[PDB]
Amino acid sequence: SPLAAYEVDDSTGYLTSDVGGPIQDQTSLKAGIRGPTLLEDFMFRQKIQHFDHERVPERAVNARGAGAHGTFTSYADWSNITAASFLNATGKQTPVFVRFSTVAGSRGSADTARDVHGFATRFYTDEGNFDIVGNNIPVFFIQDAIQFPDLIHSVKPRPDNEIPQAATAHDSAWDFFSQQPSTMHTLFWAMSGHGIPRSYRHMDGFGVHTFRFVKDDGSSKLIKWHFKSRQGKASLVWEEAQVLSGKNADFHRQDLWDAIESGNGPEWDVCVQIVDESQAQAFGFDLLDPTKIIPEEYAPLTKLGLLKLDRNPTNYFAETEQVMFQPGHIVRGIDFTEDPLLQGRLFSYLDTQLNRNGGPNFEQLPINMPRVPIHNNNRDGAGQMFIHRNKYPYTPNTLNSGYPRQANQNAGRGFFTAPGRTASGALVREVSPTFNDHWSQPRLFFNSLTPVEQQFLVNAMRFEISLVKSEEVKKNVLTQLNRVSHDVAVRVAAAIGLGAPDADDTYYHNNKTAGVSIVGSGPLPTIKTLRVGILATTSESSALDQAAQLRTRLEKDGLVVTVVAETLREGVDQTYSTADATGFDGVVVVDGAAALFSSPLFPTGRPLQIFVDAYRWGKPVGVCGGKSSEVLDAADVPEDGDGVYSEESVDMFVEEFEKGLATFRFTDRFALDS
Amino acid sequence: SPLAAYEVDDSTGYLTSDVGGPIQDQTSLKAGIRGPTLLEDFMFRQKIQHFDHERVPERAVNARGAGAHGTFTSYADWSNITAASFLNATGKQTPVFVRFSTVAGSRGSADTARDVHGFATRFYTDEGNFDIVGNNIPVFFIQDAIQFPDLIHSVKPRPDNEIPQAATAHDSAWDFFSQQPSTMHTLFWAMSGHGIPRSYRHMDGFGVHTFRFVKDDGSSKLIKWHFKSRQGKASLVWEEAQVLSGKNADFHRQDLWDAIESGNGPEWDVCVQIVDESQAQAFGFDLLDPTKIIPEEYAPLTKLGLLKLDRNPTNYFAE
Amino acid sequence: SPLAAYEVDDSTGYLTSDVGGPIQDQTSLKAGIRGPTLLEDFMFRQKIQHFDHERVPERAVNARGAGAHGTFTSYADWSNITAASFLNATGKQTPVFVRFSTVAGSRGSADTARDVHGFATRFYTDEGNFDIVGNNIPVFFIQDAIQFPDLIHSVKPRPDNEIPQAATAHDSAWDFFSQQPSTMHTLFWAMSGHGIPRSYRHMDGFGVHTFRFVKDDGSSKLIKWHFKSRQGKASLVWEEAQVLSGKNADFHRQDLWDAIESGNGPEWDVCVQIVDESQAQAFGFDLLDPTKIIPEEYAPLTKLGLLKLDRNPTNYFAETEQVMFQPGHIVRGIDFTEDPLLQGRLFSYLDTQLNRNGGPNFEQLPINMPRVPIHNNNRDGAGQMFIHRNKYPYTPNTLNSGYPRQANQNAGRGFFTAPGRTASGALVREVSPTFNDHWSQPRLFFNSLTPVEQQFLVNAMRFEISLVKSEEVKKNVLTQLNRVSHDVAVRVAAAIGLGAPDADDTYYHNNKTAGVSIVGSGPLPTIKTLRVGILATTSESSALDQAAQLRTRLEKDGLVVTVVAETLREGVDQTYSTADATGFDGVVVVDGAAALFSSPLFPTGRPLQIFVDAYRWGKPVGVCGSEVLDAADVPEDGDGVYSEESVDMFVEEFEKGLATFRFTDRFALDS
Numbered sequence A: 001s002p003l004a005a006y007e008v009d010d011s012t013g014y015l016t017s018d019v020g021g022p023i024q025d026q027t028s029l030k031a032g033i034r035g036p037t038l039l040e041d042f043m044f045r046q047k048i049q050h051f052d053h054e055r056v057p058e059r060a061v062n063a064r065g066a067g068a069h070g071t072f073t074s075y076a077d078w079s080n081i082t083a084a085s086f087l088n089a090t091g092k093q094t095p096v097f098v099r100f101s102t103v104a105g106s107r108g109s110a111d112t113a114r115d116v117h118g119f120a121t122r123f124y125t126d127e128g129n130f131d132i133v134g135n136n137i138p139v140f141f142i143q144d145a146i147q148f149p150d151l152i153h154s155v156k157p158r159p160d161n162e163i164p165q166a167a168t169a170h171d172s173a174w175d176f177f178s179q180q181p182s183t184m185h186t187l188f189w190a191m192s193g194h195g196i197p198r199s200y201r202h203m204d205g206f207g208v209h210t211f212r213f214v215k216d217d218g219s220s221k222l223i224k225w226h227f228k229s230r231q232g233k234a235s236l237v238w239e240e241a242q243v244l245s246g247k248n249a250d251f252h253r254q255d256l257w258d259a260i261e262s263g264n265g266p267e268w269d270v271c272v273q274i275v276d277e278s279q280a281q282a283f284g285f286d287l288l289d290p291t292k293i294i295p296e297e298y299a300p301l302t303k304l305g306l307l308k309l310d311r312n313p314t315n316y317f318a319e320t321e322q323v324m325f326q327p328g329h330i331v332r333g334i335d336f337t338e339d340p341l342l343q344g345r346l347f348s349y350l351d352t353q354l355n356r357n358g359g360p361n362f363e364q365l366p367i368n369m370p371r372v373p374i375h376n377n378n379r380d381g382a383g384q385m386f387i388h389r390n391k392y393p394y395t396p397n398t399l400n401s402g403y404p405r406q407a408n409q410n411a412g413r414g415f416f417t418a419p420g421r422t423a424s425g426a427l428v429r430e431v432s433p434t435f436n437d438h439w440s441q442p443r444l445f446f447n448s449l450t451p452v453e454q455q456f457l458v459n460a461m462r463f464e465i466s467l468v469k470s471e472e473v474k475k476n477v478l479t480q481l482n483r484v485s486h487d488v489a490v491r492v493a494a495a496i497g498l499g500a501p502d503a504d505d506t507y508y509h510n511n512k513t514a515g516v517s518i519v520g521s522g523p524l525p526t527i528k529t530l531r532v533g534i535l536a537t538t539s540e541s542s543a544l545d546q547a548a549q550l551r552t553r554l555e556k557d558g559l560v561v562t563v564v565a566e567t568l569r570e571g572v573d574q575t576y577s578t579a580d581a582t583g584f585d586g587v588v589v590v591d592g593a594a595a596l597f598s599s600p601l602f603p604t605g606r607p608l609q610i611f612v613d614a615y616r617w618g619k620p621v622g623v624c625g626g627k628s629s630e631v632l633d634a635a636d637v638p639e640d641g642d643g644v645y646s647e648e649s650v651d652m653f654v655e656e657f658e659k660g661l662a663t664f665r666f667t668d669r670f671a672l673d674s
Numbered sequence B: 001s002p003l004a005a006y007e008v009d010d011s012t013g014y015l016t017s018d019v020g021g022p023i024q025d026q027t028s029l030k031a032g033i034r035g036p037t038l039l040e041d042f043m044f045r046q047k048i049q050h051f052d053h054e055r056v057p058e059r060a061v062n063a064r065g066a067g068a069h070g071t072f073t074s075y076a077d078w079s080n081i082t083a084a085s086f087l088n089a090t091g092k093q094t095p096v097f098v099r100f101s102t103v104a105g106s107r108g109s110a111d112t113a114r115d116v117h118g119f120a121t122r123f124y125t126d127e128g129n130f131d132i133v134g135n136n137i138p139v140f141f142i143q144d145a146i147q148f149p150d151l152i153h154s155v156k157p158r159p160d161n162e163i164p165q166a167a168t169a170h171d172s173a174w175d176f177f178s179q180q181p182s183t184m185h186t187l188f189w190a191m192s193g194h195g196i197p198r199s200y201r202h203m204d205g206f207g208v209h210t211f212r213f214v215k216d217d218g219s220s221k222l223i224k225w226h227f228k229s230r231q232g233k234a235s236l237v238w239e240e241a242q243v244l245s246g247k248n249a250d251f252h253r254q255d256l257w258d259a260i261e262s263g264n265g266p267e268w269d270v271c272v273q274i275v276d277e278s279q280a281q282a283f284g285f286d287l288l289d290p291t292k293i294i295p296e297e298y299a300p301l302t303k304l305g306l307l308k309l310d311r312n313p314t315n316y317f318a319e
Numbered sequence C: 001s002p003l004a005a006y007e008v009d010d011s012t013g014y015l016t017s018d019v020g021g022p023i024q025d026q027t028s029l030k031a032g033i034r035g036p037t038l039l040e041d042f043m044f045r046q047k048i049q050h051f052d053h054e055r056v057p058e059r060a061v062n063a064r065g066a067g068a069h070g071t072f073t074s075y076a077d078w079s080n081i082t083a084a085s086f087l088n089a090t091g092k093q094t095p096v097f098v099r100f101s102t103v104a105g106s107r108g109s110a111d112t113a114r115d116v117h118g119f120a121t122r123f124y125t126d127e128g129n130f131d132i133v134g135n136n137i138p139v140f141f142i143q144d145a146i147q148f149p150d151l152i153h154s155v156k157p158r159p160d161n162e163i164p165q166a167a168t169a170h171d172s173a174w175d176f177f178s179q180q181p182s183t184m185h186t187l188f189w190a191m192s193g194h195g196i197p198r199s200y201r202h203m204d205g206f207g208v209h210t211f212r213f214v215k216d217d218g219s220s221k222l223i224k225w226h227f228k229s230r231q232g233k234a235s236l237v238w239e240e241a242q243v244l245s246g247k248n249a250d251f252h253r254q255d256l257w258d259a260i261e262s263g264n265g266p267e268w269d270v271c272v273q274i275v276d277e278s279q280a281q282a283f284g285f286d287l288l289d290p291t292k293i294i295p296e297e298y299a300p301l302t303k304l305g306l307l308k309l310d311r312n313p314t315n316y317f318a319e320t321e322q323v324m325f326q327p328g329h330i331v332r333g334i335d336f337t338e339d340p341l342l343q344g345r346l347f348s349y350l351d352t353q354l355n356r357n358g359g360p361n362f363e364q365l366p367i368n369m370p371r372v373p374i375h376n377n378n379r380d381g382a383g384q385m386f387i388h389r390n391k392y393p394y395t396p397n398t399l400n401s402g403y404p405r406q407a408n409q410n411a412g413r414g415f416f417t418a419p420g421r422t423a424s425g426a427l428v429r430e431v432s433p434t435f436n437d438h439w440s441q442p443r444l445f446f447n448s449l450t451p452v453e454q455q456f457l458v459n460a461m462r463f464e465i466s467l468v469k470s471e472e473v474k475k476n477v478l479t480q481l482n483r484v485s486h487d488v489a490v491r492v493a494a495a496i497g498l499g500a501p502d503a504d505d506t507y508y509h510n511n512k513t514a515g516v517s518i519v520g521s522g523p524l525p526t527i528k529t530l531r532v533g534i535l536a537t538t539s540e541s542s543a544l545d546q547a548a549q550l551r552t553r554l555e556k557d558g559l560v561v562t563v564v565a566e567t568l569r570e571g572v573d574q575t576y577s578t579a580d581a582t583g584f585d586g587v588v589v590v591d592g593a594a595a596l597f598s599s600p601l602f603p604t605g606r607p608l609q610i611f612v613d614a615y616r617w618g619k620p621v622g623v624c625g626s627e628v629l630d631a632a633d634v635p636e637d638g639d640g641v642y643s644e645e646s647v648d649m650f651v652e653e654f655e656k657g658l659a660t661f662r663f664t665d666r667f668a669l670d671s
Ligand code: HEM
Pocket: A058, A059, A060, A061, A062, A065, A099, A100, A101, A117, A118, A119, A120, A133, A134, A135, A140, A144, A145, A146, A148, A207, A208, A209, A290, A323, A324, A325, A341, A344, A345, A348, A349, A352, A353, A356, B048, B051, B052
């Protein structure tokens, strides 16, 4: 364990105060047995003081999230492109901590809200902590950091009543998107399956901004970070995400925790697109613009190394709640660009940590400490944990022999700003006209989705915009959507009873780009960790025998099996009362249980509804045992449908079923606009 | 009202800093049109500093809740039982503010979690602010305040993974309940429909503790506070409440906001049960024990006044 | 020790950020060589952010202070009187940290203010940290903790202009004293030399309150803590203290630091008076009353152990500024009493540390950590430095097997309230009538001082009360003083041109008590560390020779010698320009320097003024090798005036003078 030095064991021993005096903490000290509590009860006050002070402010954004420890391993010595030490040798390993999150919701909001997601990675390198504070979507809503509070105020709950929680489905958000057209690209992403990923493990990570890789000789290249999931791309469907948000608000954090505990820690290839400084404006947009992607057709990915998360935190508050990332945590070999969104972020993280931590020594929390020595003249501050020996903490000095020494390009492996960087011109609060095309790339993204996928995106927009009360805002939203796609505007307008404006073809085109579609990304590369719900009954010993056999066959392949029946007993994990289709990636009914398809033990129709929901939401579903018509007919599920299975043979059933799990979603169950 | 004086109107005008200097806030100041951002950009830093510091710690318990302004009106001059000035004359009106809440969930969790609920009432009286910080259930889980962090750690999410949110449905909570039998009464209440009320307006409020009414002559009587809902008693069913948690996490706060905006502000009769000091142990239990109710058969309610909530906040955070 | 693990070495290495990235910190990153500074300069912002956030609130009181580390050693197994683990074996050693302080001044105010002084001692015991948060005066101004903000607002600067700093010499303070008669006892102590101690090492430590010693059998006795200085008792005189406040604001903290660095770390016998519970009102006053001492005639001292301070801090901010004492840091074998001053203190220290630290994990700071394992269910909070493995931090639990287990009188060496303690009666906001005598003990104290000592205390009151603008307050002050002593009232009234009220003999008496007088406590038991200024000249090679001969002798006897001359050179420590009589405990002029008694190198008459100030302030003074003594109007026959050609002889006599320390016959007395 990377933080073992800081762990406190309470598996033995007597209760003590924080200063080691043995005490009790179960009854207050009173003046008589039915008397008033005494002020001199220090046991009471120290315990309740601590409780009263347990909370710290949630993150201003990305308040809802979860983290894990792991390791990064480099695939090569990358000297040829960067001086970065963590990348300087094949097989070199660096500990990491990653936190994943939504953006809008507070603490305690649902994991399966539709939102942008954070993906923040710390590399505890041998030349300092390096943080990549990224998202699951490669482009951001706005083109200047100064706009962030406008965006976030608009998305977060209306400030008179604090409604609605963790949702863009309200007037203010769509007022802002329609007034600030830069938002279109990220908006289209958020309205796709990327807004409701199946898990943190099934999403990619992006730095969003263009950064620089800087060699020890001072030359630089432009880069984009892209962490490519080894688990596949996968989304929920919206109706499923809504039910999930109520049945399991902790869905993503539980999925990550469980995958790690089972030895299925998630992996990504840490990649970059690498281009020349001369290509800043060569691709038909400006690399300083965080609303644009570099299509892969123009710049392929270079795999730098492997990221694997394989260790859960010991204490969530101390590790996951207190981790404080900064894009300012940069190392020699990396530099910034003049992306005005990035530029302003550099200020915000350092300042906001004062808010959360309540004082300036937040880098001393165990989770934030580096894994190398610290030499500097930073002193004092509330919560100062060091005892500095150097009594002359100023530069230049002779009384400490000139130490610490200055580090720079030529000495001490100092960070240095890419020396080819320049600035010219007027000091201006002006937007570059190179940033002005807000619509072509949203259209590129949309064009690249499959037909059903395009339908899901249209449907997400229909859902949210139909909840906007202002007819003017709705009109304004159609005006912007229509600049990306007339057809999107027409289909969305249909649901809200307004007319779409006439086509405006300025930014329309037919181009597509690879690697942005979820539905088109093919079957999952692994089905380990995927969840199978076996619906059985205690009414028939035969049904539980079937479920035990099925369990064995499925578990051999690393699937997580839940057997559901009316009541618990050995071999049954979950009652119908607590079971839901959102708990599973595939659902199997054992034919011994066909009769179930009213009781005081579960809501009326529960067993059938689990099956029907799983089918409606695109999941593989099946009946095992040979007798299937009763169940399939009660569920209105066609026996010969794609992703519908019926076999007597457990082996055969499982072989076919596992293909369905990799396919993951049977999209021919969803209606399309004609 | 201290609040009228602090309302700020932004329906007109040019944007200013917090020190009244007119500014813009849409583009950062840069060294050239494609250049880096300048440290001298005070418009940027004041805006972003404020954003960076918007959040404050959520309440240690009852983090999820919603409030409204209203009035309390006394039905009589209650001098006969209490010196309390807000209760000293028929018709006397006192401004109030009430916040309703769940207990275990963080500030973004669902209103329809199964839980105890807070019902905290401030009376801004002519002799000082008086708060009755109560619940929708008349009895509490534990018999000594020193146990609170035990109960709350047990019911809040397990501290290695912070799972599960806003729920007693996990080992630690049931470990605590089964090890601490005082928990049984409140547990039974939370597992009834009182754990999943239909709205804040359809639940009652209780002080829980025995308090004292004290006359100007120094004499005292023992009292229980019970705010009786004029809307009636109603619950959700469990499956319904689970679905609502997903489809509308804001369900209770929206319900209250809407009732107020429509001129249907909710009402309670503020009542007490009143017994003599000599009855502290007369009913087969100790009135100092917050796990016990006084059955109405042993002590009827006296209606003191009318509490009505009829005005929503202007800014949720500030109020 | 928690502290060794947290020491950080910067004697080698390249500069890094706080996250270990090598950086520079001397030039801002700019858009061009004459260009504006960039927001992306993280090197600048992390450095400036830290600087901008260096300061923390000063202590609400006792903000000006200094600390050191040391050791406590028990003289015996004290089982027979207390269960306290640190007292349970002969020779048992416990690390300590002590901070000494004034009370009213802010953190940059002078050490030599006239004030009560704090003497706060932490014992890092093998059963928890135990703090005795005491003062250099055994009694306090007020009888109920709830009055503390009244006392402290009255003594601290007037709140419109924040004038005057670190002084009771203003109207509000004397308005409070004269309206709240409980203040008289501490006031008399503050107005004596106890208000201006010569150093932290020359003052005693007192717990003030009655506490309990509790045995493992549950029995208790009542105790007073008294730390008896092994360096002796000594004071400044007031004029010397005033000059010192300007010439060396750091005088006491420097004195302590130097004593430690020189292997002369200060010692105290840690003592108690011990009496039975039945004696709580047996001595003519109530032992719950913090305005009363137990005269030693009624209860002698038991020496429990030795306190020695012998190591300075490494980082003042991290150790001295951040140490957070609490009377709530109590251990098994000690209990509280129902002293209403002590009772409220218990709440204050815990709460105020939230203010200073800015979050609840202040016991995690290295200086506040214990030296034993911590097992509890305290969690989270800002600045949480632990990673707790127990994921069931509630009691009762089965999922962590019942741990941590409850500790109490019969398990786990738990703290327990003394079991014989009871309470009975109405719940009242009433002062016990047993607290009502505010004047007899102030009179006892005053009676116990030597005539010159009584003069000094009278002169302190004359000085301060003459600065009170309000005629009404001055009159009220005389009313109260007169209840203690009519003579004090008369003598103080004479300075302010008011008439004293007629004698009111209700509380007058002629009783005296041992151990409260400084002047009467005899010569100092050691003169090591005391300071000798040798006034010399570069004019005469012979002056320098004389000085160096004196130096050899005096340094072997543990004295700190400063040779002063017009300019620095080999063997000269200080210039006349920077020298002052307040820098010295004794002054010697070498024969060769007689000429100096105008130059661009020091102010006119500086050499003579040092000798004259030292004589006026009562110090041993001499000439080694007539004219100098004539120039200074100093009588050759005077007590503590030395005039010898023999160096050996001079040294022997002068060193007796240093032990006597002050020659009080140089001070005029009222007649
Ligand atoms: C490219 C666009 C951006 C991305 C990908 C991004 C990513 C993130 C992520 C992942 C987190 C959560 C880190 C964690 O898990 O603890 C975060 C937090 C935060 N972000 Fe950014 N963000 C971006 C833009 C901004 C901008 C423009 C600002 C302000 C000018 C900003 C201010 C914050 C603040 C104040 C926090 C809370 C940080 C803390 O308390 O530690 N974000 N952001």
